[PDB]
Structures are given as C-alpha cells and as structure tokens.
Amino acid sequence: SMMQCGKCDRWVHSKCENLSDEMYEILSNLPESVAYTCVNCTERHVDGGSGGSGGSGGSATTKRVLYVGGLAEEVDDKVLHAAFIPFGDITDIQIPLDYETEKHRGFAFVEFELAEDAAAAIDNMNESELFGRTIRVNLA
C-alpha cells in the first residue's frame, strides 16, 4: 500500500522545519568541557568584596536563552517547561540527545519568549535543587 524510496536528491524535513540561528550557534559552538563540569575549581570563581561587576555590565538582557544543568535523566521537556513556566512564557526546550545512545546527560537549555522573565529565572533559581539534584542557570 505504501511506497518507499532509496535515493533522495532533496530533504523534505529540512525544507519544512528549520532551527533559529541563535539556538544553532550556542548549542553547536559550545565548549565540550563548559557544557558539563564534574569538579568545581576555585580559580574560575573567587570570593572578595561587595563590589565587582560595578554600576553597569555584568549581566546581559539581549539573550532570551538560558543554560540549565544538573537535571535527572528521567526528566522530559514537559518537566523543564512546567518547572520554569512560573517565571514567564517559554518557547522551546532543547536536550542534546545522541542517535546512537538516545540518552540524556542531565543538562539542557531553555528558550524564553520574554527577556525580562529570562533575567528573573537566572536571579531566582541560579543554584537551586530540582528533582532532587542541584541545577545551574545562566545566559546562553
């Protein structure tokens, strides 16, 4: 009843669906080590005085995508969306999954429709316990 084809000159899925330049550049060009860390180093972050960032700068508001790591393997896109939904409206959740293993490593990125809620999510749950594990959130 159904006919199948072997060789295909053009792709139907790629033509019909496409990914944004912002999500593609951040996810594809991310550092293999920075994407996931097992041991914490004091050299990267050090405690000092009350100042540091200053009056201007420090945090960016131009990006609406945030990094979220430290989740459980049994967590789905629905879980990440519904957990970060109280802060604002969310567009899409991406989880780097391999075709061979089809397994999750406990980290993903979140896309926020509003830039104000995005900055709110980072200031409220930057280092909080979710699903029984510690998570980290920052600008992507």
Place of tokens 């510690």: 134
Maximum Cα–Cα distance across the chain: 73
Cβ atoms < 10 Å from Cβ of 64: 21
The count of domains in the chain is 1
Q: Compute the distance between CA of residue 27 and CA of residue 122 in angstroms, rounded to an integer.
A: 19
Q: Structural domain of residue 9, as residue ranges?
A: 1-140
Cα 106 from Cα 69, distance rounded (Å): 6
CATH number at residue 50: 3.30.70.330
Output the DSSP codes for 70-135. Answer: ---TT--HHHHHHHHGGGS-EEEEE----TTT----SEEEEEES-HHHHHHHHHHSTEEEETTEEE
Of 84, 94, 81, give the one whose Cα is nearest residue 24: 94
CB atoms closer than 10 angstroms to residue 52:
7
